[PDB]
Each structure stands twice: as structure tokens, then as C-alpha cells.
């Protein structure tokens, strides 16, 4: 029940998208307590050092959900550019051409199929191109 | 509770993106505390010098937050020209020819991922460019 204010900074996440959750706490939560939407992108919680505590918890443990991350995967065989324009057929994919690498972004699960898939359409052609020579 | 007029002066922030937070204090500060948003980029706390004191703590505090700051990553491989067009198409990114270095802007987090990115994207092409030499 103590009354404190506290210092949440929310990086990943639009602190607008949490106003129902911290906000609807204040329902439950009573009084006392104050949740404050920056769009410099913190959100500063003011009140009771117990209820404050979860939207600590919850923000910072949300803003893990949304986590996205950038791999550059080499391609041996294809080229990037074709596996650019496949992948992005399907449905963020941004190839690189001096390296032959394409950049994919999303979340550790998203970024396990696309490495899965990629794996394949690398995988090395047997000797039989759109080309072949016939010696008459 | 003693009555004064304090300058807080905002720099980095919009003084009227600081309309709830500062004017919702009011609400529970209660009288005596006035806050003033001038688009000259300060904001004049006049009230209880305890009041006003958090709204310096807070905004010269949440003033924090929103820092960008920029930084100038050379190249010594690629070319910063199309570093610029791919880190772009995923989502401030500004290339110099001449040096031929990237500009970034963003706060030290943000900055922190580019310049992981950067750094694979400049890593060097084994001998292999997308021209070869076939000696017949």
C-alpha cells in the first residue's frame, strides 16, 4: 500500500498500446495509483509500490514479447534477390547482394522457419540447370 | 508546501507532449502549482517548491528518454550507398559519399543494433564478386 512514484521506460512497445491494460489495473487497483502515457516512449506508473510492481512486470515481460531481431543469412548456391522476391511472395525479408546474404527480421520463432526454408531453397542443384549441352 | 516560481527549461521534449503528466499532478498536488507550455520549448512550474521539484525530477528525467543522438560508422567494404536503400527498406539512416561512411540517428539502443548490423554488412566478400575470370 505504500504510495511512491516509479520509472517504467517501454522500448519495444507503443505506450499507447498499453493503455487498456494499465489503466483497467486502476479499476481493480483503486485509487491512489496513476499509469502516464509519453510519446517519447516511457510510461511513468506513480502509486501504490505493490500494483506499480506488476506493470513493472508486465510491461517489461510484454516488451519481451514483441522482441524483434536481424540475422544475415549467407546463401551459397541461390541468389539472394530471387529468395526475395519468393519468400515475400508468401506474406520483413531484405536481400543484400555484394554478400549474397538475405536480412530477415521478426521474433526467435518466426526466424526459425525462414531459416528452415532458406536451407532448402539453398540446397545445391544436381548438375541440371535450365541449361544442358547436347553433343550431336 | 512553501509557494515559489521555478524555469524548467525542456529541450528535447515537445513541452505540450508533457500536457497530461504535468497538468494531472494538479489533481493531486492539488492548488497553488502552475504549469505553463510555451512552444518556445520550456515549461514555468509556479507552485509548492515539492510539486514543481518532481516535475524537474520527471521531465529532466523523462527529457532522458527521448535522446538522440547521432554518429558517423565508416565502410571500409561496402559501399555506404546501398547500406543506406537496405537498412532503410526494413523500416534516420544517411549515407556521405566521400568518406563513404553511414550517418545513424536514434537513442544508444537503437544505435547499438545498426551497429551490429552494420559491421556483418561490411564484412569482407571472399574473392568471389559477382564477376569471375575463366581462363579457357
Redesign the interface.
Known sequence: DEMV?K?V?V?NVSVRELAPILRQMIDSAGSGN?V???????I?LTGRASVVERLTEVIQRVDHAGNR??E?IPLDNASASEIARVLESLT?I?A????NSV?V?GDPATRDKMRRLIRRLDSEMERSGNSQVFYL
Open positions: 512514484t520509472v521506460p522500448r496513476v502516464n502515457y509519453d510519446p517519447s516512449n516511457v511513468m531481431t536481424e544475415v520483413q531484405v543484400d547482394e555484394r554478400t536480412i527480421s
